[PDB]
Amino acid sequence: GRYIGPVCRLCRREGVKLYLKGERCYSPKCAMERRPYPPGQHGQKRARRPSDYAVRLREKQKLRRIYGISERQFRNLFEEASKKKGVTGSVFLGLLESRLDNVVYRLGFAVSRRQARQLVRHGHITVNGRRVDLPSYRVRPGDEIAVAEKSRNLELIRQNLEAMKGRKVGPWLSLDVEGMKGKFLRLPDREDLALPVNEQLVIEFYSR
Amino acid sequence: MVKIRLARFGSKHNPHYRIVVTDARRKRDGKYIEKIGYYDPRKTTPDWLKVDVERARYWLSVGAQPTDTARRLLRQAGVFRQE
Amino acid sequence: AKGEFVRTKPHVNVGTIGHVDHGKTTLTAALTYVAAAENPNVINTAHVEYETAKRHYSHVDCPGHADYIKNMITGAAQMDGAILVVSAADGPMPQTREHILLARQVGVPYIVVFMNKVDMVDDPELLDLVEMEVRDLLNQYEFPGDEVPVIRGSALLALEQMHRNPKTRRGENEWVDKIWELLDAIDEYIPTPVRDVDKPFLMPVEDVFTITGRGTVATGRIERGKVKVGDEVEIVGLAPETRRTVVTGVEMHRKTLQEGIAGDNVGVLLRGVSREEVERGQVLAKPGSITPHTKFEASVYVLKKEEGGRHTGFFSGYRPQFYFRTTDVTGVVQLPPGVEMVMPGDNVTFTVELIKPVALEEGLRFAIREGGRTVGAGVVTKILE
Amino acid sequence: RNLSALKRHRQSLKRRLRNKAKKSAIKTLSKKAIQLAQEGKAEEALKIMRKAESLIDKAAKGSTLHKNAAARRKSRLMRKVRQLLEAAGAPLIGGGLSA
RNA sequence: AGGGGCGUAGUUCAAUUGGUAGAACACCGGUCUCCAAAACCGGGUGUUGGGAGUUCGAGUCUCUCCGCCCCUGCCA
RNA sequence: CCGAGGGUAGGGCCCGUGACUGGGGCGAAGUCGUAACAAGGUAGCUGUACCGGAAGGUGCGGCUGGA
RNA sequence: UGGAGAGUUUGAUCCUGGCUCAGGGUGAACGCUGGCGGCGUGCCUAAGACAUGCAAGUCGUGCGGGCCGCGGGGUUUUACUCCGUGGUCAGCGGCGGACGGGUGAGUAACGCGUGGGUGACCUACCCGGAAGAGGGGGACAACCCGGGGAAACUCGGGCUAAUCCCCCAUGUGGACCCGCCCCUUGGGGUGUGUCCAAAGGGCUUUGCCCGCUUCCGGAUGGGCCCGCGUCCCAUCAGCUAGUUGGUGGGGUAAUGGCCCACCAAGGCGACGACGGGUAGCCGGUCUGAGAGGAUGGCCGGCCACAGGGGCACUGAGACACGGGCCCCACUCCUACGGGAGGCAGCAGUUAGGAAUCUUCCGCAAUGGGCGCAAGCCUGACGGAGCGACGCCGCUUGGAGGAAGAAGCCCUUCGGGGUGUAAACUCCUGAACCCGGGACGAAACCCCCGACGAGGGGACUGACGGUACCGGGGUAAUAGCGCCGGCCAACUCCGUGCCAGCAGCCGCGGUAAUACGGAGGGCGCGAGCGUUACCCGGAUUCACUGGGCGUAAAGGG
Ligand SMILES: C/C=C\C=C\[C@@H]1O[C@](O)([C@H](CC)C(=O)NC/C=C/C=C(\C)[C@@H](OC)[C@@H](C)[C@@H]2O[C@H](/C=C/C=C/C=C(\C)C(=O)c3c(O)cc[nH]c3=O)[C@H](O)[C@@H]2O)[C@H](O)[C@H](O)C1(C)C
Numbered sequence A: 001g002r003y004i005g006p007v008c009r010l011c012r013r014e015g016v017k018l019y020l021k022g023e024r025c026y027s028p029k030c031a032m033e034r035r036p037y038p039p040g041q042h043g044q045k046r047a048r049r050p051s052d053y054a055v056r057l058r059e060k061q062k063l064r065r066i067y068g069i070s071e072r073q074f075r076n077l078f079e080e081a082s083k084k085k086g087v088t089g090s091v092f093l094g095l096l097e098s099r100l101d102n103v104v105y106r107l108g109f110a111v112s113r114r115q116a117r118q119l120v121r122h123g124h125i126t127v128n129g130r131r132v133d134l135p136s137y138r139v140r141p142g143d144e145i146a147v148a149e150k151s152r153n154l155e156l157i158r159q160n161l162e163a164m165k166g167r168k169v170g171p172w173l174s175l176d177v178e179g180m181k182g183k184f185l186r187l188p189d190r191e192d193l194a195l196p197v198n199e200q201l202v203i204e205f206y207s208r
Numbered sequence B: 001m002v003k004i005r006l007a008r009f010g011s012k013h014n015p016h017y018r019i020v021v022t023d024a025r026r027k028r029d030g031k032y033i034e035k036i037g038y039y040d041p042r043k044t045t046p047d048w049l050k051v052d053v054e055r056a057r058y059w060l061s062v063g064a065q066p067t068d069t070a071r072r073l074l075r076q077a078g079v080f081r082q083e
Numbered sequence C: 001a002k003g004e005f006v007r008t009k010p011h012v013n014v015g016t017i018g019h020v021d022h023g024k025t026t027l028t029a030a031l032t033y034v035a036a037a038e039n040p041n042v043i044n045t046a047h048v049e050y051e052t053a054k055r056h057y058s059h060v061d062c063p064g065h066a067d068y069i070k071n072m073i074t075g076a077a078q079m080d081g082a083i084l085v086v087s088a089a090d091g092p093m094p095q096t097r098e099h100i101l102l103a104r105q106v107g108v109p110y111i112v113v114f115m116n117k118v119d120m121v122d123d124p125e126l127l128d129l130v131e132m133e134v135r136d137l138l139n140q141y142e143f144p145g146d147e148v149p150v151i152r153g154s155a156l157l158a159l160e161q162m163h164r165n166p167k168t169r170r171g172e173n174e175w176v177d178k179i180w181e182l183l184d185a186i187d188e189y190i191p192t193p194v195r196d197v198d199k200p201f202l203m204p205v206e207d208v209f210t211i212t213g214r215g216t217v218a219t220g221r222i223e224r225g226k227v228k229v230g231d232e233v234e235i236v237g238l239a240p241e242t243r244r245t246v247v248t249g250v251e252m253h254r255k256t257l258q259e260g261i262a263g264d265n266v267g268v269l270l271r272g273v274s275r276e277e278v279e280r281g282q283v284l285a286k287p288g289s290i291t292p293h294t295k296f297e298a299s300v301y302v303l304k305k306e307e308g309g310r311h312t313g314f315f316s317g318y319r320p321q322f323y324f325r326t327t328d329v330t331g332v333v334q335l336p337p338g339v340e341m342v343m344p345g346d347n348v349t350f351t352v353e354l355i356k357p358v359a360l361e362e363g364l365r366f367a368i369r370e371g372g373r374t375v376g377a378g379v380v381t382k383i384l385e
Numbered sequence D: 001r002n003l004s005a006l007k008r009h010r011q012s013l014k015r016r017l018r019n020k021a022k023k024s025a026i027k028t029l030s031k032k033a034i035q036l037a038q039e040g041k042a043e044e045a046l047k048i049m050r051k052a053e054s055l056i057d058k059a060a061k062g063s064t065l066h067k068n069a070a071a072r073r074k075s076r077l078m079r080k081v082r083q084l085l086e087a088a089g090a091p092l093i094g095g096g097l098s099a
Numbered sequence E: 001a002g003g004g005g006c007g008u009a010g011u012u013c014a015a016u017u018g019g020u021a022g023a024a025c026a027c028c029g030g031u032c033u034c035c036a037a038a039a040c041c042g043g044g045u046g047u048u049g050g051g052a053g054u055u056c057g058a059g060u061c062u063c064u065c066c067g068c069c070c071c072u073g074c075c076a
Numbered sequence F: 001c002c003g004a005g006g007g008u009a010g011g012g013c014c015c016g017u018g019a020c021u022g023g024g025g026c027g028a029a030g031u032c033g034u035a036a037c038a039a040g041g042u043a044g045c046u047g048u049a050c051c052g053g054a055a056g057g058u059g060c061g062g063c064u065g066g067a
Numbered sequence G: 001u002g003g004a005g006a007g008u009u010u011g012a013u014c015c016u017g018g019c020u021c022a023g024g025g026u027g028a029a030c031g032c033u034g035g036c037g038g039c040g041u042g043c044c045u046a047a048g049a050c051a052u053g054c055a056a057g058u059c060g061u062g063c064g065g066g067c068c069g070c071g072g073g074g075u076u077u078u079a080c081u082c083c084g085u086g087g088u089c090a091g092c093g094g095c096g097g098a099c100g101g102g103u104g105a106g107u108a109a110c111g112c113g114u115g116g117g118u119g120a121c122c123u124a125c126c127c128g129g130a131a132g133a134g135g136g137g138g139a140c141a142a143c144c145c146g147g148g149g150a151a152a153c154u155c156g157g158g159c160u161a162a163u164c165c166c167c168c169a170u171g172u173g174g175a176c177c178c179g180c181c182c183c184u185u186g187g188g189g190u191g192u193g194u195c196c197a198a199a200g201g202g203c204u205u206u207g208c209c210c211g212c213u214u215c216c217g218g219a220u221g222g223g224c225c226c227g228c229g230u231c232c233c234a235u236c237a238g239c240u241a242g243u244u245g246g247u248g249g250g251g252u253a254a255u256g257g258c259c260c261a262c263c264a265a266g267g268c269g270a271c272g273a274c275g276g277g278u279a280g281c282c283g284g285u286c287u288g289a290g291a292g293g294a295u296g297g298c299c300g301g302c303c304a305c306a307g308g309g310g311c312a313c314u315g316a317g318a319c320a321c322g323g324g325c326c327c328c329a330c331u332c333c334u335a336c337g338g339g340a341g342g343c344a345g346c347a348g349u350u351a352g353g354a355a356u357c358u359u360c361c362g363c364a365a366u367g368g369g370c371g372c373a374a375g376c377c378u379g380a381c382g383g384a385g386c387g388a389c390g391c392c393g394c395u396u397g398g399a400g401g402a403a404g405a406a407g408c409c410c411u412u413c414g415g416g417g418u419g420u421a422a423a424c425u426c427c428u429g430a431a432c433c434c435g436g437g438a439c440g441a442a443a444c445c446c447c448c449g450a451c452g453a454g455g456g457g458a459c460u461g462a463c464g465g466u467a468c469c470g471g472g473g474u475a476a477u478a479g480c481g482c483c484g485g486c487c488a489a490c491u492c493c494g495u496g497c498c499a500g501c502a503g504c505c506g507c508g509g510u511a512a513u514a515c516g517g518a519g520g521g522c523g524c525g526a527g528c529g530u531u532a533c534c535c536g537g538a539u540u541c542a543c544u545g546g547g548c549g550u551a552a553a554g555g556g
């Protein structure tokens, strides 16, 4: 299940710093900032020119690790992404963005994705009225995601909703910092997601 | 004779029927001479019942024995309201 | 066409003992006809019974004889009291002492003595001289031999006038009455121990049957707690893994039982189990209570020769057979260092690893035998593995 | 151990006799007719044949024959007889076969 | 559950007069070789199925126990 | 009359098996030679026939994939 | 909207070619491990054998009795028990048990698929239309009584009722023979002759509701026939006497050598007859870029079978899964002359097997049979149970936290690694606690209105006190594989061609990224591997899409 284990360890290994921890993985110490190299007893030595295979794995893992999704859903979502009309690169990314917990984190609320998940698993999150607890919930157009009323006075929702004064949300999501709402105006685009992931490779990983 | 019953589709704890004109001797969900409507007994959808007419009456005007619930639904869709 | 079983009278089971061809097995085949004239309406141990108008009884008539010890024993522990049958002929003989000895190594309390074969040449100072030897014998063994209700009579003769008319009452025939003196002998003296029903559960397996149309049935006496139909149970003992099942049936002497209490001899039809998966020894308890263990540091007291035990002593690496609940295993022994001098009459503790997993729980008792004699008894302490 | 059904075997046996007889009757009567129609007995020929025909259509009343089974048995008579008489006889009794 | 059997090196088989238990062929250890095979020297390497028992000693004779084979048992 | 099945009898097809026997495959370090590979020490190969512990030899004709 | 290749012949090269791997899939099984839920799904083998219980009945408004509880004495008493209501045991009549449910043995064939034919046919109950429903007669059960028997039951005498049976009449009409007209294989009209009908039951009573009879039409469901399509062996090449055709019959709802006499001598075959092996066919399912290849489990259509085998009876329909007759094998009872039985229905046992479940609850719903109706029956069906057997969702926590504890592991002794990982701090609250708690169910029926349309009323929930909602609430599971190359991931020790690994290439003979253990890493995660089998890759049977001088391959 959704990994659960050392993460600022993948911050490393994939070689492209990540913040799966939010606060700290943002400080002068994302783990990377002290060992921009792979874990293990080796981790810091001559690297063979990565096999054309290795490359894609690395690209997929990179992308997938970024979300916390299990391989099963990931591929699954990718297959779906395929049939749907349009470019898989774009589409699949979009579908990766609709993931409730993701929107939860993409919209203040949660500092980390892993924390945006526990929020949805515990109920604190809500959608078009009725609350949803499935991280995999697939958000659509025009749906605002409000917090709950029993949480609003929680020590956490405060600070995390506090870092919202000033900062601006993605070009495809609004936000009523006061009355915790925020809608999902429209599916994100390739560009908007400034992600260190070469989608077309990840795609190629699923060809063979 | 040639009845007018309901064949259970949908799934476990999710009824959804199909108003059909089958030869009484078939199985409930077996083959069937023709379909003329559906019925979601749990309503859950503004249209849990919809049925054809010119055809319902047709089979009715040729010896098609409706069932208790079947006849009910037919009626409820203004099948016998002769005006 | 089965018939239920209803509780009213207390339940107690007992068995016969004596020298091979003597009185038992036939005494049994008579004591039954008695308690059957007024009610109920109508080589291998033979679980039977009889309902006196005073109590419910389950008779265990172990075939007896030598060679049949392993089987003899497993039945002795199942009873609260035994009927020591003795004949008027050769009188107290070898296997009459042997069975009695065992009885006093199984905890078997109280003994009812019934002299059979009296119908053979009435010797004046004999049926009065026989009881002498007996009582003295029960004493050479520490038994309460001096308060045992000794009654005489040719049991079988009480049967000829039964196997021709199943309606014989009391009084008539100084034989078929003669057998009511042994009933009012067990009705008295031999108590009725308290069987705790506040405990988990446990039924040592004795025999296993494949009842046609229903499946495997495990017969056994209850160690404690209770078990009715539809209760999850586990089979702990032998086997590679402890398999779990649901009790789909319970019966008392081929009669539907509505609820089993301790002390009861009941057959258990387990849901989905092969006659090859269950076997004597292993027990049936509540999922969770007790588990399986091969090694233990039990406290043991090696009997003294002058009382059957060894007269030499064993060195660490002695492989004997330990008796648990209803069966016997085998196991190497390791001494707690320097103690490589455990000889007769001694009393110590050590390590033992049975080559067959068996239910062990620390607080359980057992015996040790090798070479045809109980070399020592004891109790278990916390398990190693 | 048992059930209704039996009620069906008993009736079975009954109805069996009911038309087993009606049957072998039409048979012996169909024979006699021709057994004369080729004799020359035109008169006492169309007489029993007239009876036969009765018994045939009569059997059709019940579960004995019905439809063409009865209709057919008829032709192969009014054909077997009619084509047995015109072999030197002339249809006397205008009672039965059509003139 | 109860009878009757067989278990000896690495494997096939002897000592069945109560006496540390040997033959064959293998294998192992050196020597030569990178290492083997050959060749030359030199070795019984064995829980005598386990464990106890009589005893001056038990492979042989008692009992118990393990695995396997065989016959015969077993509807709460 | 027909008729399931049962007999007696003789065929066909398939499978199992048999003392013994034919050749085949495979198998770290066995025996005998030396056919072939370099006119491989008699160019080779080939159909056939006779012969020979064995590879093979020889005869007749053929091929060059032999100078 | 759709196509990826790699390893391996050599000292090296190019080519040919085989083997092997990476991807999907499975009614799965085996190993390690295992928390929840939803929807699925579960004897692939012995069509082996089976203890129990249950899978089909219902109508008294078709008809006559027995019997028990009771209006209340018939006569004035317990004698005509007449009568009256609801019951109740079988009987007689009726409709249904020929559907629904199981299985795949058999079948290579009009069995199936697809398209048609029938002037060669049938079709219970249901519809619309036409006309009728009048005289009469009789039987056998049940029951009383006698009898043989262990039983199952059987026989004899005698009452008796019908919607049972039979006779006459009526002939709207219909059937048959012959003539004629239209028409074209036997269809439709007509005329003379013959032949054929029928039941009364309940009320609320010159009327209705339920039935009845004959004909016509409609529906629906079927039978029979035909074209094309449907596996491997040619080391199977010739097969055939009811054989092929005819004539007249028998037979059938109906065509037909289907069956039979008699006559003719035919019919079939390399376009594969006959024979052997295997197999139920299809919609579809898996794979595939496609063309194809494989398959045919769950659901739906067709077929076939009901211990093995033959046969009919009843009936609209069966040669009939829980009907009958008989032979056989096996199961049991037996008072030894004859008796009972068939789980490939449901749940369960045993055997076989690598392997496949509960003797569960409910007719509440849908469907079904019988019923005027109430209602009864219904292991069809609706559900619950068991197994990660599959798919889908969910959990084992989130956020802080050191130039970085310990332990373990490496180390050029300075250090590096597992690692923000932990511990530690705040932190949300899977489970579980208390309370509330369904949708699935609105008709039949009752009242109004005529029992029609429409309007109103009442009963009814197996799953379940489950889902779901509210409030309370503890940090609470991790494994399996793999790390020489293919193929993502490397270091120490042990071992020393041993022990072992191995899908292919190949590793191991004292420094082994290849054995075994460890540290560390990689993949995936309630799973992860293994074995088996299908497609792919394999343009490696090549139609799409290959080849033959010397690689296999040109016939002398
Ligand atoms: C023995 C088999 C199974 C035992 C199982 C278990 O035993 C127990 O663990 C039990 C717990 C104490 C146990 O350990 N039993 C294990 C032991 C227990 C021993 C206890 C009591 C004693 O005391 C020293 C007791 C008999 C004592 O002996 C004396 C007898 C001496 C006899 C000498 C023999 C004589 C003349 C003779 O002719 C003779 C002979 O008999 C045999 C053979 N050849 C002979 O020639 C006297 O009679 C005393 O009374 C529990 O009861 C368990 O619940 C159990 C029943 C499952």
Ligand SMILES: Nc1nc2c(ncn2[C@@H]2O[C@H](COP(=O)(O)OP(=O)(O)O)[C@@H](O)[C@H]2O)c(=O)[nH]1
Binding pocket: C019, C020, C021, C022, C023, C024, C025, C026, C027, C116, C117, C118, C119, C120, C153, C154, C155, C156
């Ligand atoms: N004379 C006599 N014979 C007896 C007596 N008890 C049993 N029997 C006989 O002993 C023989 C049976 O022995 P059994 O009952 O089997 O004793 P078990 O061997 O102890 O079971 C038979 O002949 C019985 O009739 C008795 O008390 N007196």
Ligand SMILES: [Zn+2]
Binding pocket: A008, A011, A018, A019, A020, A021, A024, A025, A026, A029, A030, A031, A032
């Ligand atoms: Zn980080």
